[PDB]
Amino acid sequence: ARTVKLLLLGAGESGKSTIVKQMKIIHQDGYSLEECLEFIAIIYGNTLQSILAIVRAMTTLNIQYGDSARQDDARKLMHMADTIEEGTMPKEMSDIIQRLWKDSGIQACFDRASEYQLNDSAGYYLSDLERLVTPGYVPTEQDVLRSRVKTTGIIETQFSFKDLNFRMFDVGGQRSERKKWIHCFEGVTCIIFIAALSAYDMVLVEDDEVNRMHESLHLFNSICNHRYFATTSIVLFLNKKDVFSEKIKKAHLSICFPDYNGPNTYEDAGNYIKVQFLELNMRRDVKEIYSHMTCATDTQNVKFVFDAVTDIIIKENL
């Protein structure tokens, strides 16, 4: 019936494309077997890049292996890397990664992932390597949802829900991609801005001196107060709440906000972060921004949250 133009915005790796995958699962026909098979190479690539990053970090962070034998494994894994066909995972490689993942040194390095760049799904894939390499492996929906591919251009997702015809557009979030955003700012019905809660102790890939959350805060400030959005519903998704729940117990929020006095807890820290974003809206007197703590990889959560977003879009049309 009514056409709704939705824009998914946010900094690099915040979770935009994952929400898009969820729309296909929830509001379209989901993934076909053939579509799933196409993700094997992507998954094998992600898994390889993750362990490679952790291995590299061993040297970078000067962390020794638990068992010296792992050092040999690490080196031969490195040679295999530039030798194997991309997207593949030979048994010789899997056996090595398997042994490395179990190493205490590797684990200690894994825990220090915020000090270097590591795929969000590194732990997910590596801890489940046996299943992934089992001959005949076919990706599950969660495997597909956890996959990583940096996108840059604009992607349109169209679906019907509650009699509304959605035209959802997502774009890359890196600094280099933002210049072109303005071309998509016309006649927008709703903007979903995605910010990763767990980014508070992370630095940008574009500038290792810039805190990821400070970057998203700056970007949100620009977005929520933009001229083109005065009459558009804005919703904030504070994504990666699952990663955040674990992180908050180890990393102090003060890393990001030196002024924070509250307890480093999920509820407190989460609410404080939420306030930091929402306080940037200088049009609050005329427009309220709704926010949701989300886990883009969780279908039921995304299903729930998107249902609530459509309700807001519908209400705003009253």
Ligand SMILES: Nc1nc2c(ncn2[C@@H]2O[C@H](COP(=O)(O)OP(=O)(O)O)[C@@H](O)[C@H]2O)c(=O)[nH]1
């Ligand atoms: N654990 C977890 N991983 C997430 C979540 N949202 C996204 N990811 C993962 O983080 C990575 C980057 O997400 P992606 O959607 O590609 O980011 P985009 O660059 O903003 O499109 C992917 O590997 C996702 O599976 C989340 O809520 N929890």
Ligand code: ALF
């Ligand atoms: F910000 Al991206 F793929 F890294 F949309």
Ligand SMILES: [Ca+2]
């Ligand atoms: Ca993307």
